[PDB]
């Protein structure tokens, strides 16, 4: 399948070169997989989700996304126009309030929730969790992300936006989950992106167009935006039977575009998510 005039990040993930604008993908499109977006929520009524999104949990007075960030990230995972895996089921878990904040105890509860909740969902092709959130190092936050992964969920997490080594942030610094840095449309490391040995992969993170609340759309930037490209890619590759939740981060690294990014610091991986789709 070919989507013309796609957001640049979608085009980049199915291309061997920057500077193209058509996104190419197998029509299976993550059908039969699920992705949890653990964030400020998801505006499930957005036409872009086509009925494939739903809120499954909140820790606050409402499951509504009153921010937009969770909706934007879900849209990069799975919206019809802005998404990587255009037929995945999206589940929203609102661990962050409408100011984008959340206590680590709530974040942890949300991760453990997803590890159990997948057993109440139909995801025969596999389950992914996208975590576009983070703060300072916490062994407890890392342990939670490690249990979620261990339970059979492909966990993708933001490296962080500090232009710093991600070893000092959580769940970024957890070795067993997929830690995602951000790039721009010219294959430069995004200027805010964290880096370091704990990074596993980069995805598109600067100037990313996706869904927003009030049935709208917006372009914003962050390792928050790179993470759901990877999450959507993993769901798409699991539906194709190419990988599994346990192996998807390795598989994405194995199949990435290599050595193509600039301003990657010595000792950080130079690997850009790529779907290796041959139309």
Swiss-Prot record:
<feature type="active site" description="Charge relay system">
    <location>
        <position position="224"/>
    </location>
</feature>
<keyword id="KW-0645">Protease</keyword>
<feature type="disulfide bond">
    <location>
        <begin position="178"/>
        <end position="249"/>
    </location>
</feature>
<feature type="active site" description="Charge relay system">
    <location>
        <position position="69"/>
    </location>
</feature>
<feature type="binding site">
    <location>
        <position position="260"/>
    </location>
    <ligand>
        <name>Ca(2+) 2</name>
    </ligand>
</feature>
<dbReference type="GO" id="GO:0005576">
    <property type="term" value="C:extracellular region"/>
</dbReference>
<feature type="binding site">
    <location>
        <position position="175"/>
    </location>
    <ligand>
        <name>Ca(2+) 1</name>
    </ligand>
</feature>
<keyword id="KW-1015">Disulfide bond</keyword>
<feature type="binding site">
    <location>
        <position position="177"/>
    </location>
    <ligand>
        <name>Ca(2+) 1</name>
    </ligand>
</feature>
<keyword id="KW-0732">Signal</keyword>
<comment type="function">
    <text>Hydrolyzes keratin at aromatic and hydrophobic residues.</text>
</comment>
<comment type="similarity">
    <text>Belongs to the peptidase S8 family.</text>
</comment>
<keyword id="KW-0106">Calcium</keyword>
<keyword id="KW-0865">Zymogen</keyword>
<keyword id="KW-0720">Serine protease</keyword>
<feature type="binding site">
    <location>
        <position position="16"/>
    </location>
    <ligand>
        <name>Ca(2+) 2</name>
    </ligand>
</feature>
<feature type="domain" description="Peptidase S8">
    <location>
        <begin position="7"/>
        <end position="279"/>
    </location>
</feature>
<dbReference type="GO" id="GO:0046872">
    <property type="term" value="F:metal ion binding"/>
</dbReference>
<feature type="active site" description="Charge relay system">
    <location>
        <position position="39"/>
    </location>
</feature>
<dbReference type="GO" id="GO:0006508">
    <property type="term" value="P:proteolysis"/>
</dbReference>
<feature type="disulfide bond">
    <location>
        <begin position="34"/>
        <end position="123"/>
    </location>
</feature>
<feature type="binding site">
    <location>
        <position position="200"/>
    </location>
    <ligand>
        <name>Ca(2+) 1</name>
    </ligand>
</feature>
<keyword id="KW-0479">Metal-binding</keyword>
<dbReference type="GO" id="GO:0004252">
    <property type="term" value="F:serine-type endopeptidase activity"/>
</dbReference>
<keyword id="KW-0378">Hydrolase</keyword>
<protein>
    <recommendedName>
        <fullName>Proteinase K</fullName>
        <ecNumber>3.4.21.64</ecNumber>
    </recommendedName>
</protein>
């Amino acid at each position: 399948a070919a989507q013309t005039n796609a957001p640049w990040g979608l085009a980049r993930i199915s291309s061997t070169s920057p500077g193209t604008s058509t996104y190419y993908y197998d029509e299976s499109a993550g059908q039969g997989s699920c992705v949890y977006v653990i964030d400020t929520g998801i505006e499930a009524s957005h036409p872009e989700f086509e009925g494939r999104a739903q809120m499954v949990k909140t820790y606050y007075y409402s499951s509504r996304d009153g921010n937009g960030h969770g909706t934007h990230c879900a849209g990069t995972v799975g919206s019809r126009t802005y998404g990587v895996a255009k037929k995945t089921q999206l589940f929203g878990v609102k661990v962050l309030d409408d100011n984008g904040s959340g206590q680590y105890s709530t974040i942890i509860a949300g991760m453990d929730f997803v590890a159990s909740d997948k057993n109440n969902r139909n995801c025969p092709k596999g389950v992914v969790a996208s975590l576009s959130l983070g703060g300072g190092y916490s062994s407890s936050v890392n342990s939670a992300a490690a249990r979620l992964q261990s339970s059979g969920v492909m966990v993708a997490v933001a490296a962080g936006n500090n232009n710093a080594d991600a070893r000092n942030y959580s769940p970024a610094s957890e070795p067993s989950v997929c830690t995602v840095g951000a790039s721009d449309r010219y294959d430069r490391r995004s200027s805010f992106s964290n880096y370091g040995s704990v990074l596993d992969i980069f995805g598109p993170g600067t100037s990313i167009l996706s869904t927003w609340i009030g049935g709208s759309t917006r372009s914003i930037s962050g390792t928050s935006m790179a993470t759901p490209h990877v999450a959507g890619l993993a769901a798409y590759l699991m539906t194709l039977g190419k990988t599994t939740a346990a192996s998807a981060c390795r598989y994405i690294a194995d199949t990435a575009n290599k050595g193509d990014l600039s301003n990657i610091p010595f000792g950080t991986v130079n690997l850009l998510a790529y779907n290796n789709y041959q139309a």
